[PDB]
């Protein structure tokens, strides 16, 4: 006579004292983190710095994207402390998972354009500015948004408040019936939801990875021979001689690998007269005739008075992208497992209610650990500029 | 800041030649990339040519074999020759380079190390 009525296959899954205090505890904390931060993040991207790039725009939407999963995060908090007990109705609980769930799907597809923005700005930046307009990163983002929705379209219909006959207790849950709701709903997850961005994101910096590896490793092989070929001037007999013109040698080889990306038949030719000349200065040295291969390795720089400024690098930009692919993969990796042996147990092959609890309990672990660390993406992700930490320092 | 000083720009005949020059200031560190950009009146913006700190250009096919670019790594300014100059050539010349800071963490959203130029105009009459 009202709402429909669902009988539990396991319904003491998930139910113990440590997760109704530990859970909203923590659901507290990222509402008041997240609410402190990623509000402070879109005043300085669109107060302090008015939006003039692509990737701001990106920033100050994935920071409102989580600013909205945080609005309804106290809903979540009270319903695990009342031992899952939904009051809120059915009006609410259509919303309060969808908002979960668009701002899940937008974030991941926010972080993913950022990627494809980084990928473009650095390795083909002259090209890709006139495409990178403002209007494309607007636009971007409607399509994100309706992308976000329509893969969570699903959360907005099967979504009901159910009553369970054998525990009286109201709860707003998905219902994985027997037959006659789609198994994809929890596949979409781990395959629209981090399979397809994660191999995106990581190829993208992947290839700036080996973008930036090959402008460094060609900037240190000019280091070596500069400066092995200043040792030859202050040499003394032909050892001293021989080692530096052995290491130059091996630095020319390694340089004639780089390419970028019969232009590059000269490049390589370039490197074979390089080498073709250290070749005759070493034979010199073989023989041990230092005056006369001092004269060989200085008119190699016969191509060479004035100090030129020179290449900005850092050598840290490693440890930046290595952990921005790993604090994407190992936040979300919690999560699509004990999704994944959901998806196992929703309609296929575990039938065991001792296992179907290591799942309800480690859930929201593993949603916590989504959420904590999700919702930090725009403020560290913000620190990565010299403009921007700056404004942020000063609130 | 990054301030990209432009000059060679004027009305000149058809067929004839111009050189267009951009020294890169206030930049502590070298630059990056450096290219060329023109805007045709009524049009959007198209890419000249870029050359790379190393020496690789990348040309349009609108001026292959006319417009030939180079840099000098010592100035940090930009050269664009530009061989028969066609009425089609007149447009507004912006000059582009691209600028990390000293410890550049390849994120920037206040100018995402990409600067500009004022820009001369380059009428060919015929």
């Known amino acids: 006579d009202g709402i429909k009525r669902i009988q539990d296959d396991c319904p003491k899954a998930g139910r113990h004292n440590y997760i109704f205090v530990m859970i909203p505890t923590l659901y507290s904390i990222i509402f008041v983190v997240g609410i402190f931060g990623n509000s402070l993040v879109v005043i300085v991207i669109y107060f302090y710095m008015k939006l003039k790039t692509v990737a701001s725009v990106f920033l100050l939407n994935l920071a409102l994207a989580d600013l909205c999963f945080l609005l309804t995060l106290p809903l979540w908090a009270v319903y695990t402390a009342m031992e899952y007990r939904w009051p809120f109705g059915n009006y609410l609980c259509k919303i309060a998972s969808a908002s979960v769930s668009f701002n899940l799907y937008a974030s991941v597809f926010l972080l993913t354009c950022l990627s494809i923005d980084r990928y473009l700005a650095i390795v083909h930046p002259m090209k890709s500015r006139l495409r990178r307009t403002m209007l494309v990163a607007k636009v971007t983002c409607i399509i994100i948004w309706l992308l976000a929705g329509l893969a969570s379209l699903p959360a907005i219909i099967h979504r009901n408040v159910f009553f369970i006959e054998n525990t009286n207790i109201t709860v707003c849950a998905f219902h994985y019936e027997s037959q006659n709701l789609p198994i994809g709903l929890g596949l979409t997850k781990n395959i629209l939801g981090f399979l397809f961005p994660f191999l995106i994101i990581l190829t993208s910096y992947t290839l700036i990875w080996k973008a930036l590896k090959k402008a460094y490793d060609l900037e240190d092989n000019w280091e070596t021979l500069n400066d092995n070929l200043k040792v030859i001037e202050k040499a003394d007999n032909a050892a001293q001689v021989k080692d530096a013109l052995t290491k130059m040698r091996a630095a020319a080889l390694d340089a004639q690998k780089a390419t970028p990306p019969p232009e590059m038949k000269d490049f390589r030719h370039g490197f074979d007269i390089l080498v073709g000349q250290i070749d005759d200065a070493l034979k010199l040295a073989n023989e041990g005739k230092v005056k006369e291969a001092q004269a060989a390795a200085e008119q190699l720089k016969t191509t060479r008075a004035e100090i030129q400024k020179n290449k900005p690098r850092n050598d840290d930009i490693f440890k930046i992208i290595m952990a921005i692919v790993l604090f994407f993969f190992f936040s979300w990796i919690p999560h699509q497992i004990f999704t994944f042996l959901d998806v196992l147990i929703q309609l296929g092959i575990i039938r065991d209610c001792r296992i179907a609890d290591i799942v309800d309990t480690a859930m929201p672990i593993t949603i916590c650990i989504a959420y904590f660390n999700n919702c930090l993406n725009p403020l560290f992700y913000g620190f990565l500029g010299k403009k921007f930490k700056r404004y942020f320092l000063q609130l | 800041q990054v301030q990209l000083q432009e000059s060679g720009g004027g009305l000149v005949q058809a067929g004839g030649s111009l050189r267009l020059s951009c020294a890169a200031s206030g930049n502590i560190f070298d630059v990056d990339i450096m290219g060329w950009y023109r805007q045709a009146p009524g049009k959007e913006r198209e890419l000249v040519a870029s050359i790379t700190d190393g020496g690789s250009t990348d040309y349009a096919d609108s001026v292959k074999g006319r417009f030939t670019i180079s840099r000098d790594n010592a100035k940090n300014t930009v050269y664009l020759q530009m061989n028969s100059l066609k009425p089609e050539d007149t447009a507004v010349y912006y000059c582009?380079?691209?600028?990390?800071?000293?410890?550049?963490?390849?994120?920037?959203?206040?100018?995402?190390?990409?600067?500009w130029g004022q820009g001369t105009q380059v009428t060919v009459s015929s």
């Open positions: 582009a380079a691209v600028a990390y800071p000293d410890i550049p963490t390849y994120f920037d959203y206040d100018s995402d190390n990409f600067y």
